[PDB]
Design a protein around this ligand. Structure first.
Ligand SMILES: NC(=[NH2+])NCCC[C@H](N)C(=O)O
Lengths: 203, 124
């Protein structure tokens, strides 16, 4: 009896859903009367499904309706935890213990990767006489990020970056510049600790 | 790391799951694991100790720094003994102090078990 796992680490976007699998051997038809399937995170019970019955009374309230075992797929020796709207507490080491004739357990790691992927952008004509414009970029993700402004010359411009927040960071950057029409500037969000450089273009 | 429910059946479920899983971590013989469950707790047996430690921490009776937690033992023993015998368990087993954490785990299992063995769940 040997429980296995396709991926040992899941890297999943904040808010996007998640399914982490745990396989186990099923030679004949599955006998739900003798199956036990237990998912736990850290200091947290996620699934306790034993003898056909998913025990809803032990599941942590912070999973109490976001998570569920894909019961259809157990008949395929596949114990799948699914988790809707992956938040920031959902990151960490999970464990899946299965018991069906034998017993095994495996651990899975889940990072909730929040790259600053949805960059918002605004350009404001502060002053039509002096052509003073205000170019903004606003994105959100878990490792804090700096913002680098560059004109089309790829010279580095100086902008104002304000970082705020539970564990996800919101980074708004603004660049006041005297610029003409059709000129291109570039807001890059260096996600620092994980190098996930993303450059949005403002025209 | 684990769960605490409030109906004999949920508890019996959590009992059988945590027992199996702690056998999986420790390596403890099935017979020694039963003796632990049955009350027969070799305090100085290292496999016994590790299983006590795993299983008490799964039911959150010992926390991550080996501190006895009254809440978790209430949640488990409310289902085998009366309220006042629960109070007396808390206060008696609070004096157990060991710098050897596994030795501490085996001794708490001792101290708890003397109020009712955990195999009593199989009897509900
Ligand atoms: N000249 C500049 N680019 N100034 C940037 C100011 C950033 C601001 N103090 C912040 O860290 O929240």
């Amino acid at each position: 009896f040997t429980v296995t796992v396709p991926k040992d680490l899941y890297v999943v976007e904040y808010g996007s859903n998640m399914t982490i699998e745990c396989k186990f051997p099923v030679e004949k038809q599955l006998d739900l009367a003798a199956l036990i399937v237990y998912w736990e995170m850290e200091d947290k019970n996620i699934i306790q499904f034993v003898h056909g019955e998913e025990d809803l009374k032990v599941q942590h309230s912070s999973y109490r309706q976001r998570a569920r075992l894909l019961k259809d797929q157990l008949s395929l020796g596949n114990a799948a935890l699914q988790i809707t709207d992956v938040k920031l507490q959902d990151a960490g080491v999970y464990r899946c213990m299965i018991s069906y004739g034998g017993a095994d357990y495996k651990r899975i790691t889940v990072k909730v990767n929040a790259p600053y992927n949805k960059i918002n952008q605004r350009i404001l004509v502060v002053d039509p006489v002096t052509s003073e414009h205000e170019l903004t970029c606003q994105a959100e993700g878990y490792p804090k990020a700096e913002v680098i402004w560059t004109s089309s010359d790829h010279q580095v411009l100086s902008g104002k970056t304000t970082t705020t927040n539970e564990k996800l960071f919101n980074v708004t950057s603004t660049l006041r510049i005297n610029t003409t029409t059709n000129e291109i500037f570039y807001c890059t969000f260096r996600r620092l600790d994980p190098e996930e450089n993303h450059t949005a273009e403002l025209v | 790391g684990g769960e605490t429910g409030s109906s004999i059946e949920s508890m019996k479920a959590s009992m059988i799951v945590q027992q199996i899983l702690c056998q999986l971590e420790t390596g403890i013989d099935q017979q020694k694991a039963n003796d632990v469950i049955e009350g027969n707790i070799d305090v100085e047996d290292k496999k016994v100790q590790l299983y006590c430690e795993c299983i008490l921490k799964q039911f959150h009776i010992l926390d991550k720094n080996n501190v006895f937690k009254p809440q978790g033992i209430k949640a488990v023993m409310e289902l085998l003994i009366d309220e006042n015998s629960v109070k007396q368990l808390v206060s008696d087993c609070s004096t157990i102090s060991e710098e050897n954490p596994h030795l501490k785990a085996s001794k708490l299992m001792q101290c708890i078990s003397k109020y009712k063995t955990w195999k009593s769940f199989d009897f509900l």
